[PDB]
Amino acid sequence: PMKGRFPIRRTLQYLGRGDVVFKESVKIMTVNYNTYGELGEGARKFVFFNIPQIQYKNPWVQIMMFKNMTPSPFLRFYLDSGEQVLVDVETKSNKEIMEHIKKILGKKEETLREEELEKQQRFHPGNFGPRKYCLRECMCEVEGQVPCPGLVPLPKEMTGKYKAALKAST
Amino acid sequence: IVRSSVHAKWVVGKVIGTAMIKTAKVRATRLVLDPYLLKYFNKRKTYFAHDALQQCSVGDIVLLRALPVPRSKHVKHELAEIIFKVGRVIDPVTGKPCAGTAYLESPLSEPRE
Amino acid sequence: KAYHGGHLTIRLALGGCTNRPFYRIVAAHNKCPRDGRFVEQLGSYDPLPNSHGEKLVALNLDRIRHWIGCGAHLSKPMEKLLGLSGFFPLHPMMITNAERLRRRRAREVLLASQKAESEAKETEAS
Amino acid sequence: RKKVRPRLIAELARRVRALREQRNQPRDSQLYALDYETLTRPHSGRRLPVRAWADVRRESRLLQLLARLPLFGLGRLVTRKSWLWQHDEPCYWRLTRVRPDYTAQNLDHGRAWGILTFKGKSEDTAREIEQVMYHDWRLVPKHEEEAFTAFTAKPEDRLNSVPYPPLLRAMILAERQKNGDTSVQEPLLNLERTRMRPWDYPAKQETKGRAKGTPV
Amino acid sequence: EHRELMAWNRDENRRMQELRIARLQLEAQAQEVQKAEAQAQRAQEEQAWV
RNA sequence: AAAGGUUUGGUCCUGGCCUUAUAAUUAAUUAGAGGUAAAAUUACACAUGCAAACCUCCAUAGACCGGUGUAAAAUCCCUUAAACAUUUACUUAAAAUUUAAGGAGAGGGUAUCAAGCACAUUAAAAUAGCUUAAGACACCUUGCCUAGCCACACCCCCACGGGACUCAGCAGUGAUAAAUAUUAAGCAAUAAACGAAAGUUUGACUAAGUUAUACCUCUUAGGGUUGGUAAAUUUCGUGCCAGCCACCGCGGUCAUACGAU
RNA sequence: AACAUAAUUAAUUUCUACGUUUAUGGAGAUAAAAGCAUACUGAGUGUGCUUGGAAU
Ligand code: FES
Ligand SMILES: [K+]
Ligand SMILES: [K+]
Ligand SMILES: [K+]
Ligand SMILES: [K+]
Ligand SMILES: [K+]
Ligand SMILES: [Mg+2]
Ligand SMILES: [Mg+2]
Ligand SMILES: [Mg+2]
Ligand SMILES: [Mg+2]
Ligand SMILES: [Mg+2]
Ligand SMILES: [Mg+2]
Ligand SMILES: [Mg+2]
Ligand SMILES: [Mg+2]
Ligand SMILES: [Mg+2]
Ligand SMILES: [Mg+2]
Ligand SMILES: [Mg+2]
Ligand SMILES: [Mg+2]
Ligand SMILES: [Mg+2]
Ligand SMILES: [Mg+2]
């Protein structure tokens, strides 16, 4: 049995379910939440369930969490311009908190698809090379082309050993 | 007005020391994923910051701004803001003094003092 | 290696096996090894006729135009490929070599006619 | 890290070696001395190419000509036998400054400056002359300057524009039709912006390298 | 678009602040009533204790 | 791992070792040829030959290719700035390639290495600070980041200088080691250098030679094993002897376990 | 240690010479009522403690 409570939180599939990818402006997200209370329950679940997913998609963002420092839970984002975005998450479900932060400071689906396509621009199916980078190492693999001499011996007339002998004979 | 090279243009941390002149030692923490366990833990870093007015006290949360030119070998940041003063927190949501999970001044009242 | 000096070049990198050559058209710093570190792959050249009797050249004409616009030199074999394709004019030595081959076959034909004439003299002798 | 430590000997060696180069710079009389029996430079042992042998024995160096003239021939015109043979149009240098090698026992090695007139076309500024140590120079007589420098330019007949390569022309016409531009104009390359100088055109001597002072 | 989202954010914060004052107002009324009753018991017990 | 064998009088638990799969090297026995890939005891010492030229003199190149894993926890990824021993265009802007200063994070061992001893800040030059059990410092070992990258180039970390005075270029030799490729052919192809160019040069490379080290296509048959794990022993000899075992074990005269068959 | 010459085309020389590590009695094969801690002597006994002894 995997240790801890809700061990599914420690699986790559769960971490990859996060949908909040912050804009490049976002630099820090401080989380102020209370460990005891009734109006801060959604905030506690957000730290428990969602903060791992947010960090997984935003490795360069500093997430620092503070406990029992204020009467109410809130989120404060620090942007690169110097702006500070305060969010109030009291009486808000963890799902509501995730959707709110996605709207205000989350990249849209269109933007992300463009980056994924751009990332693969230099991979070409026609390119030949190692399996790590390319589909086919050599043109011998293609159908109709001359096969590799190791797999199929070349005709005698196409071999340097044979051609050299004829030149001596001439 | 080119910005710093350092990645940490903005860092939040706690003032863990203030014994150097006009400098505050700040401990920041980030979350790092353990590859074997797939769990996040706290990796903490120490940042020297220029406290021009010596207005920092141990235990207070602060925001640091990366300096354009390193002031010294270790001082590459300045004190942008004191997010929370030690024991003197002011609730961002309501704006009233608080002492833990309680209001020193009720939000219903309007003291304006 | 940490090269000092040199320029980008578009050249042919030899691949394949013994008696089975295959080329990768690549853009690479000139001081790098022939089959080593390159910058971008710009196509491939298969110099052996296939089942259909066709030697197959692949040219990434968008990236080739990009790297020629940035100072990339060209190797002499690659200039010959670009000339045969029609993307560049035919190389001066492609034209000169074809003229030399025409002059060399003209002599051979004349010699064969002279030999046949000499053989005709043998026929006259009987 | 912090276990990487200074290399004082390496720093000392680099600086020390530099000083020797500055003080022990060789001179034109020594770098470009020649042994005419073997046609080999004694300083480095470099043997001249075969195609230069006739001229090394049959032609003069520039400062051999200028050392015999008052003021080292400032204002005089000098041409090269290689140009005389290659180009019908006048090619010459108009000398403006001349710094001989005083160490040379005949003042036959040095540097020169002048204004170039190549194939009848004259440059506007003076620059240093290259290949001053070559056996190729011929001083022009004063009485022959007017006839030597007389040139009338012919109308230029080299094409200014040419067709595009066959494939590259088809790609241009295809893009026109795709973009809606309907025309039967033939794409043309413009050659005026990129016209090549002759291969024997004088090069920039100021940016040229000089041989080292280590004898072989 | 950034400015619009930052304006919507402040509105959401004010809308929730209004609810907070409404909720805390109701508590003040209820807690005040309880405090008066508790003070009455102290008065009765304090007099008896004296 | 889909597991198996093995503590005991017996059962169960715990717990190690071993077996069955895969590969590399060396060795014993054995073997025809052909195609292909690879080639590898040693940073020990080296006879001999070759590996860098080009070219109307100037320059350019010999700073690459090639080789080895010396040193160093040395690195990875990323940021910033500037260049180049450069290219191509403009007489000024796109690249390739480097250098320097840095840091989100990641990065071998020993804690019987627990303290390091100037490792800090301020900028009137004062303050007494800086790193460290969230692993400093010390010591030890190690090429890693693998379209490739880093480090080294007889030794002295370097190389003014000194000295044990040069093959860790190809091919060879001695010594050493369980470890064993040709002192070979050609610049025809591609790559590099040089030249305006026809061209020239290259132990890079190409085409060969050698070798069951690997795969493919054929064709001869050899090697081992035969108590259990774990597929398979029939007669004799030996008799706790000679021998055999990866583990458990076998042999003291009816040996399925040793030797021959 | 690091000056000066020159200058009616422009150049010249200077731009030095300590300490620290490695190395040359003990424990293991072939068989040719009890205990823990501790003290004394020799396992004997002393003091405390445990039941993993026993006692209707
Ligand atoms: S791998 Fe393609 S010819 Fe061998
Ligand atoms: K077991
Ligand atoms: K063997
Ligand atoms: K070294
Ligand atoms: K060649
Ligand atoms: K057999
Ligand atoms: Mg020339
Ligand atoms: Mg063998
Ligand atoms: Mg190399
Ligand atoms: Mg080593
Ligand atoms: Mg050696
Ligand atoms: Mg050295
Ligand atoms: Mg060798
Ligand atoms: Mg060598
Ligand atoms: Mg071997
Ligand atoms: Mg040869
Ligand atoms: Mg050229
Ligand atoms: Mg028997
Ligand atoms: Mg037997
Ligand atoms: Mg007790």
Side-chain angles (χ1 to χ4, degrees):
Chain A
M2 279 180 75
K3 294 171 173 284
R5 302 163 292 179
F6 289 95
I8 197 166
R9 298 180 299 152
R10 300 192 288 100
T11 68
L12 287 179
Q13 199 189 343
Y14 177 91
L15 288 161
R17 282 175 163 91
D19 56 346
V20 185
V21 181
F22 290 134
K23 299 170 191 295
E24 297 174 37
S25 50
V26 178
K27 293 277 148 285
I28 318 180
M29 176 181 64
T30 61
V31 183
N32 272 80
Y33 71 107
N34 299 323
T35 60
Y36 53 105
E38 296 78 30
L39 302 190
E41 189 57 62
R44 286 186 289 269
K45 286 169 171 173
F46 175 83
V47 167
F48 189 88
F49 289 106
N50 301 135
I51 286 283
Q53 290 175 319
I54 291 157
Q55 192 69 76
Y56 185 74
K57 297 282 193 203
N58 307 314
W60 288 71
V61 178
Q62 171 178 11
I63 300 177
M64 205 160 174
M65 309 196 263
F66 307 89
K67 308 199 310 187
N68 301 308
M69 287 193 71
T70 53
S72 51
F74 59 90
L75 301 173
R76 182 145 51 188
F77 298 83
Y78 296 77
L79 306 184
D80 190 75
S81 62
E83 178 172 2
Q84 301 181 4
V85 188
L86 183 75
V87 179
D88 177 26
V89 296
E90 193 170 57
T91 307
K92 256 176 179 181
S93 176
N94 66 318
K95 184 156 279 164
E96 291 174 15
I97 299 162
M98 276 282 269
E99 286 173 5
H100 182 109
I101 64 167
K102 188 172 179 294
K103 164 167 181 172
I104 62 161
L105 293 164
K107 291 183 174 178
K108 312 313 186 197
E109 182 179 343
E110 290 181 345
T111 296
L112 298 162
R113 290 160 46 78
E114 290 165 43
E115 291 162 1
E116 289 295 341
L117 295 155
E118 286 170 329
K119 178 184 172 183
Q120 300 158 20
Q121 276 177 6
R122 304 316 186 191
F123 162 80
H124 202 268
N127 279 14
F128 292 86
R131 303 298 178 184
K132 169 175 186 177
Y133 307 102
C134 304
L135 304 170
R136 297 161 289 184
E137 294 174 349
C138 187
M139 184 61 81
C140 68
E141 299 177 35
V142 179
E143 182 189 13
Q145 302 296 103
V146 165
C148 175
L151 307 185
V152 178
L154 278 163
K156 294 177 184 180
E157 286 60 54
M158 289 185 64
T159 302
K161 190 184 195 172
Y162 175 87
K163 294 167 193 171
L166 293 180
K167 297 311 190 184
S169 299
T170 54
Chain B
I1 299 169
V2 297
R3 291 170 65 77
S4 65
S5 71
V6 299
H7 308 290
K9 304 287 198 289
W10 294 104
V11 61
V12 174
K14 187 178 80 177
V15 169
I16 55 160
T18 65
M20 306 182 280
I21 284 167
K22 291 187 184 74
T23 302
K25 193 162 64 187
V26 166
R27 170 182 287 158
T29 75
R30 295 179 184 83
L31 289 170
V32 183
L33 183 79
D34 185 294
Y36 178 60
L37 299 177
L38 293 179
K39 173 175 188 297
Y40 280 95
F41 294 86
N42 278 313
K43 156 72 175 49
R44 59 198 205 177
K45 198 147 182 170
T46 295
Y47 289 96
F48 293 5
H50 187 57
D51 196 24
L53 308 183
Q54 282 175 121
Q55 66 194 114
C56 279
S57 286
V58 177
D60 59 11
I61 311 312
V62 297
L63 186 70
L64 314 178
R65 187 197 298 98
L67 281 169
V69 181
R71 188 152 184 149
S72 62
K73 181 174 177 191
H74 297 290
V75 182
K76 312 197 177 190
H77 287 75
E78 57 191 333
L79 176 75
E81 171 172 306
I82 294 171
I83 298 153
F84 301 123
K85 190 71 188 179
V86 61
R88 281 155 287 180
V89 176
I90 308 292
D91 186 12
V93 168
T94 71
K96 296 309 193 188
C98 63
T101 64
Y103 300 91
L104 289 178
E105 289 188 1
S106 180
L108 297 185
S109 66
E110 184 64 13
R112 280 173 169 187
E113 302 185 36
Chain C
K1 175 164 285 199
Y3 301 109
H4 293 131
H7 51 81
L8 183 76
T9 306
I10 299 162
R11 50 201 206 181
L12 292 161
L14 178 62
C17 288
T18 293
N19 304 315
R20 175 53 174 102
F22 162 71
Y23 294 103
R24 295 185 330 281
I25 303 163
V26 294
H29 193 77
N30 71 326
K31 283 191 156 170
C32 292
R34 174 186 82 186
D35 305 330
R37 171 152 57 85
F38 65 96
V39 183
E40 185 167 341
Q41 195 182 142
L42 297 177
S44 51
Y45 174 29
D46 181 4
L48 302 194
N50 65 12
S51 49
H52 289 89
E54 325 185 320
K55 302 173 50 159
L56 291 192
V57 179
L59 293 162
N60 190 336
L61 292 177
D62 171 53
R63 302 304 305 169
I64 288 161
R65 284 193 309 264
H66 180 259
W67 289 117
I68 295 169
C70 295
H73 290 257
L74 281 156
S75 72
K76 290 182 192 183
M78 258 299 293
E79 293 189 283
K80 166 163 185 180
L81 278 181
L82 292 175
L84 288 171
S85 77
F87 181 84
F88 265 32
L90 298 175
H91 191 264
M93 285 310 305
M94 286 176 66
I95 297 151
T96 300
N97 279 327
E99 290 180 346
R100 291 168 172 180
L101 178 64
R102 281 182 173 183
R103 288 202 203 82
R104 187 172 63 79
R105 285 194 189 177
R107 289 190 290 276
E108 291 173 8
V109 168
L110 176 56
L111 288 160
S113 299
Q114 286 169 0
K115 185 171 183 179
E117 189 192 327
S118 296
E119 287 173 347
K121 294 179 179 179
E122 294 177 350
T123 302
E124 293 177 350
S126 303
Chain D
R1 289 219 70 179
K2 303 180 171 175
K3 199 192 175 184
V4 175
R5 37 167 175 175
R7 285 188 176 181
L8 303 186
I9 301 172
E11 289 182 44
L12 169 66
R14 186 202 306 181
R15 294 179 292 184
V16 164
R17 284 200 311 276
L19 293 186
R20 290 160 175 173
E21 297 151 32
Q22 310 306 323
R23 309 199 169 271
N24 299 323
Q25 286 181 334
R27 302 302 201 99
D28 301 43
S29 50
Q30 301 152 35
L31 284 186
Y32 311 116
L34 188 71
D35 178 29
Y36 290 83
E37 295 191 47
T38 59
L39 298 177
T40 298
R41 294 212 185 280
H43 174 87
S44 59
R46 122 72 126 189
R47 185 190 209 82
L48 302 192
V50 172
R51 285 182 177 168
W53 288 358
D55 291 6
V56 167
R57 302 200 177 103
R58 202 172 151 86
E59 298 294 337
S60 306
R61 300 193 308 279
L62 179 57
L63 275 87
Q64 281 186 326
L65 303 168
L66 302 183
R68 312 197 299 269
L69 308 170
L71 305 173
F72 290 94
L74 287 188
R76 299 294 306 275
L77 300 185
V78 292
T79 188
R80 299 185 69 182
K81 160 268 178 193
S82 61
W83 298 343
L84 292 169
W85 282 21
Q86 185 61 24
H87 302 307
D88 295 341
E89 308 89 349
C91 309
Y92 56 92
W93 281 93
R94 190 180 305 274
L95 298 158
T96 59
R97 173 150 45 93
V98 173
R99 279 169 59 193
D101 189 23
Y102 51 84
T103 62
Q105 192 274 325
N106 297 350
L107 302 192
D108 54 337
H109 291 95
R111 301 161 65 180
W113 287 261
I115 301 159
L116 179 68
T117 305
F118 197 82
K119 288 181 77 178
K121 307 181 177 183
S122 185
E123 294 189 329
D124 306 326
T125 191
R127 52 195 191 87
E128 198 177 338
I129 310 176
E130 67 157 15
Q131 304 191 353
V132 174
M133 67 290 299
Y134 276 50
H135 300 92
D136 207 33
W137 298 91
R138 282 189 196 175
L139 178 66
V140 178
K142 298 177 187 178
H143 62 107
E144 298 279 338
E145 278 172 357
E146 308 306 305
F148 176 72
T149 60
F151 175 66
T152 307
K154 299 175 180 179
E156 187 160 272
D157 308 289
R158 51 173 52 174
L159 285 165
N160 286 13
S161 73
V162 293
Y164 270 92
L167 180 63
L168 191 52
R169 171 184 170 280
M171 294 196 297
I172 291 160
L173 293 174
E175 181 174 9
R176 279 187 198 171
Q177 185 176 2
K178 181 177 182 178
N179 297 348
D181 181 11
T182 307
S183 174
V184 294
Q185 286 299 286
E186 297 291 336
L188 278 169
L189 273 159
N190 171 247
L191 302 177
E192 295 180 67
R193 292 173 287 172
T194 47
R195 198 74 79 172
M196 306 197 303
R197 291 264 187 75
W199 75 75
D200 52 302
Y201 195 88
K204 287 280 173 165
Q205 177 60 30
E206 300 104 334
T207 65
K208 184 179 291 184
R210 173 184 191 77
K212 305 302 186 179
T214 304
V216 169
Chain E
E1 185 163 6
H2 181 67
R3 288 162 178 177
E4 290 178 295
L5 292 165
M6 290 309 104
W8 182 82
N9 179 61
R10 297 146 190 167
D11 303 357
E12 192 73 0
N13 287 17
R14 290 196 315 274
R15 183 195 74 85
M16 286 180 74
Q17 182 65 13
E18 287 157 26
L19 289 160
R20 167 175 299 95
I21 294 296
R23 181 187 67 254
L24 294 183
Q25 274 291 352
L26 174 60
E27 287 179 13
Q29 308 322 302
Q31 291 170 14
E32 177 51 42
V33 167
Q34 293 173 348
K35 176 165 179 178
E37 182 175 37
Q39 184 163 2
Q41 306 322 300
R42 175 164 60 265
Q44 295 158 44
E45 177 274 342
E46 184 164 28
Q47 187 55 63
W49 189 84
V50 172

